[PDB]
Design a protein around this ligand. Structure first.
Ligand SMILES: Cc1ccc(CN(C(=O)N[C@@H](CS(=O)(=O)CC2CCCCC2)C(=O)O)C(=O)c2ccc3c(c2)CCN(Cc2ccccc2-c2ccc(Cl)cc2)C3)cc1
Ligand SMILES: Cc1ccc(CN(C(=O)N[C@@H](CS(=O)(=O)CC2CCCCC2)C(=O)O)C(=O)c2ccc3c(c2)CCN(Cc2ccccc2-c2ccc(Cl)cc2)C3)cc1
Lengths: 141, 140
């Protein structure tokens, strides 16, 4: 496990250094990087929407399950687009931070599963029809 | 498709947690501290970086020898965390150089020489110096 962990650290570091020069380790690393940046950008440009939602997540005694469903269903109520997909990831991120703040980091494993399930079951048909994650990479960069 | 989506979720969530001083896992904290230490080294020792960068002409033939000559000179006087960071930075430079010169094939090779050197020549020191968790603590 020590040999495969070292291989993982090499891959992660090299992916990073390549991305700083506008190159990519792989198709997957290019997707991870563009999404990391689009998330940061969305959070900075929509600072007001981000801050209002995070205040509500902090205040609510409601379950992370309920907050997840309320927000995600409202977000995709009018359909799927790349910008809304970025906001979905940003929301997941905020929900995980809030869970850790409340000493409920166990909820992070649950949020990650709900995100992967929502992506696989409700976002993947639109994603594939619209060029896949490679098209998002091209649109963002 | 299901495992790729899981990978994207994990990567994005690891990032957002790290921005708030939290971590997805101990591995994610190691990856993040090394990413930052690499940036820091590259800034602090840009002179040594830039001087080495220029003298490097990469070809599949000369690529491995260039890696071995530099790495051997780097750990000639022993292993320390700073030299480990510089090893990663060197691997990174060798990689971006290969892509600049339309030699994308070499990327995968450099990564294998780095992993091998880390596993065979750096891991005994690391385990006898507290592991990567000690690096995380020392850096932060
Ligand atoms: C990086 C980035 C992402 C999104 C945006 C804004 N943008 C946009 O510009 N759309 C384009 C067409 S596109 O999407 O094809 C372009 C692509 C190109 C490649 C990647 C970048 C986008 C346009 O309108 O011309 C939205 O569609 C957009 C998406 C979602 C929401 C907004 C705007 C406004 C705020 N709104 C609140 C909300 C509503 C309901 C439920 C929840 C939440 C919620 C609140 C807070 C948070 Cl943290 C998360 C979600 C979410 C700008 C930058
Ligand atoms: C973030 C950071 C990393 C490294 C350093 C430099 N540092 C240091 O300051 N060491 C400390 C003690 S420590 O190591 O415990 C601090 C740790 C602990 C926490 C995690 C990070 C820091 C000390 O001075 O006592 C070296 O040991 C050090 C390592 C390597 C080289 C130098 C200094 C000087 C320049 N030298 C050129 C070179 C020489 C020979 C062969 C090759 C190359 C070569 C050329 C280019 C490149 Cl890209 C890489 C390597 C590489 C500063 C900051």
């Amino acid at each position: 496990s020590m040999s495969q962990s070292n291989r993982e650290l090499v891959v992660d570091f090299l992916s990073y250094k390549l991305s700083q020069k506008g190159y990519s380790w792989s198709q997957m690393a290019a997707v991870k990087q563009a999404l990391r940046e689009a998330g940061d950008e969305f959070e900075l440009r929509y600072r007001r929407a981000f801050s209002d939602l995070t205040s509500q997540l902090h205040i609510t005694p409601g379950t992370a399950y309920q907050s997840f469903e309320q927000v995600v269903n409202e977000l995709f109520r009018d359909g799927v687009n790349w910008g809304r997909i970025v906001a979905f990831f940003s929301f997941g991120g905020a929900l995980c931070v809030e869970s850790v703040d409340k000493e409920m980091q166990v909820l992070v494993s649950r949020i990650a599963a709900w995100m992967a399930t929502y992506l696989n079951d409700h976002l993947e048909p639109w994603i594939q029809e619209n060029g896949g994650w490679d098209t998002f990479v091209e649109l963002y960069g």
